[PDB]
Design a protein around this ligand. Structure first.
Ligand SMILES: C[S@@+](CC[C@H](N)C(=O)[O-])C[C@H]1O[C@@H](n2cnc3c(N)ncnc32)[C@H](O)[C@@H]1O
Length: 177
């Protein structure tokens, strides 16, 4: 397809991912128990669980520990760049995603002006992998000075105990291991 059409379709995966998830696509009685956006990274926010103090009367706060630290692993980056693999964080947790040959990730934030049109049935499976089936993220600056990170992708845990990966519109059955 045209370069413009690829980019328009990629941008749509972003819009589709923000659409409200309310019921399972094949099981309309099944409802979402947790929705986690997927931001591929080699970095983690972590809270100390406790400060150890030498004063019996400390500066009062709601919660033991402290504000979050950012930590990183050089290991996590190989994998996302081979497009075979990815890590992401949700709450205090680290998830590892093992990618099948029919999905991919792009680690660098998406910017359309640098998007390369590689297409002047095994060329169609290729055009679809990179437009519909590639996990991506982008990064925006508001008119109110806010920085907005957006992802293509969502991991959903369902009311029946199952899990799916939403990539834009498309749905992939997924399993916890
Ligand atoms: C997290 S689940 C269910 C949580 C519920 N308290 C439970 O554990 O049974 C549904 C919620 O996830 C959020 N959500 C809905 N659509 C989403 C989307 N496209 N991307 C990220 N989060 C979404 C909304 O806040 C929605 O109410």
């Amino acid at each position: 397809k045209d370069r413009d059409s690829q980019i328009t379709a990629i941008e749509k995966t972003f819009e589709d991912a923000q659409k409200s998830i309310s019921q399972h696509y094949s099981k309309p009685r099944v409802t979402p128990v947790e929705v986690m956006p997927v931001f591929p990274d080699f970095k983690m926010w972590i809270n100390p669980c406790a400060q150890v103090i030498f004063d019996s009367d400390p500066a009062p706060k709601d919660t033991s520990g402290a504000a979050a630290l950012e930590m990183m692993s050089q290991a996590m980056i190989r994998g996302m760049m081979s497009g075979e693999n990815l890590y992401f964080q949700s709450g205090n947790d680290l998830y590892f995603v093992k990618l099948p040959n029919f999905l991919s990730v792009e680690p660098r934030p998406f910017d359309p002006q640098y998007y390369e049109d590689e297409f002047e049935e095994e060329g169609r499976t290729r055009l679809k992998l990179k437009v519909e089936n590639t996990i991506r993220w982008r990064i925006r600056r508001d008119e109110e000075g806010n920085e907005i990170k957006e992802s293509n992708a969502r991991i959903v845990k369902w009311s029946d105990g199952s899990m799916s990966l939403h990539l834009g519109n498309e749905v992939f059955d997924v399993y916890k291991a």
